[PDB]
């Protein structure tokens, strides 16, 4: 398979991006889509030339002696094609867009290659009209995510001459949904200092795929969507968040996935899981240098495949993604001796089974925060 060749690299980047955001901002909500970030910078590398192209692909976790550049783009084409398939009420549409300054011509080679493989959306704007470009960029991302991601870019300089945005429209239905009449406000303990009131869903009729980890200090719940998608909710033991984050590798995800396919762990459960929405918005041009993209955001960057007329330094890149846990899914005679209350911080890993890739990755510290 082409898409199976790029999956190890993309998984590596996901948890590398997580560990950085978790380290630099410890007590805060995290939520992003490694795949939309990977796909967009893989798309952007079609415009980079010689050395600066290698640094992008190597930053994304690819081994350029193992894989060719052709293997990466064919990998992403077969990955995106699989995720765009009709689905069982399941939508995972990865997308990206570049807004280049007017008075800079896109090269035809770039326009063709980006659109033919990644279906990227390329635009001209006048960055001196700062209120205009922000309106133009945000409405495009709003239109493409169908309202779900709004106000992506809050501010921009006038010297800026290119902005990259990446997003993912996500709609999914639970295999086993919750009944909304049984959902009531209950306590959520963010830490030993403070407590918050959140709507808490309840389900004690179904069996679930869940385990209590022998080796690590956490419980892992696996809740399927309808279609080829799944959510891993990892609930660490009290005070042991950063201990689980310390070991949150791609090898660890595949351990929990393989363990939760065994019928041994398919047992009855009184599940209490909150009904909430969090968002994570990330200024990628400031974050990605620390993951080994220092060349792309500098004077020595070579993006002459995008345009020859000017040097393309001082370029911004933004990404936003929202987690929606609802009774249905994302949109708005049973006795249990086993329970799981998600009433303190937990990790979230939305995982595509058809493409073996992490669609979303994040942490829920306070579910109420606007
Ligand atoms: C990045 O990739 C390279 C290349 O990996 C692939 O190369 C293609 C062509 C194909 O052969 C495929 O099967 C390979 O996976 C990795 O480089 C290789 O590293 C291993 C060490 O783990 C080397 O094997 C060793 O060979 C020496 C004798 O030369 C022995 O002493 C050892 O016992 C062992 O067998 C191998 O020579 C390297 N291959 C090449 C083509 O140079 C590289 O490890 C990988 N980076 C990673 C995983 O971080
Ligand atoms: C617009 O781009 C598409 C896809 O571009 C990707 O594929 C190549 C070019 C590579 O550089 C990669 O990095 C790009 O992202 C082009 O579609 C491809 O067209 C070629 C031939 O026109 C096909 O490859 C092979 O061509 C040789 C002869 O040169 C034949 O012997 C082979 O049988 C085979 O046809 C390839 O299948 C196409 N790829 C896809 C994904 O459809 C397209 O040509 C380009 N258009 C323009 C005007 O530049």
UniProtKB/Swiss-Prot annotation:
Keywords: Glycoprotein, Protease inhibitor, Secreted, Serine protease inhibitor, Signal. InterPro entries: Serpin_CS, Serpin_dom, Serpin_fam, Serpin_sf, Serpin_sf_1, Serpin_sf_2. The keyword Protease does not apply. Its main location: secreted. Expressed by the liver and secreted in plasma. It comes from the Eukaryota. It holds the Pfam family Serpin. GO terms for molecular function: serine-type endopeptidase inhibitor activity. PROSITE patterns: SERPIN. Transmembrane segments: none annotated. The N-terminus is blocked. It is found in: Secreted. GO terms for cellular component: extracellular exosome; extracellular region; extracellular space; platelet dense granule lumen. Glycans are attached at residues 63, 112, 193. Inhibits human amidolytic and kininogenase activities of tissue kallikrein. Inhibition is achieved by formation of an equimolar, heat- and SDS-stable complex between the inhibitor and the enzyme, and generation of a small C-terminal fragment of the inhibitor due to cleavage at the reactive site by tissue kallikrein. Heparin blocks kallistatin's complex formation with tissue kallikrein and abolishes its inhibitory effect on tissue kallikrein's activity. Belongs to the serpin family. Monomer and some homodimers. This is Kallistatin. It comes from Homo sapiens (Human). The gene is SERPINA4.
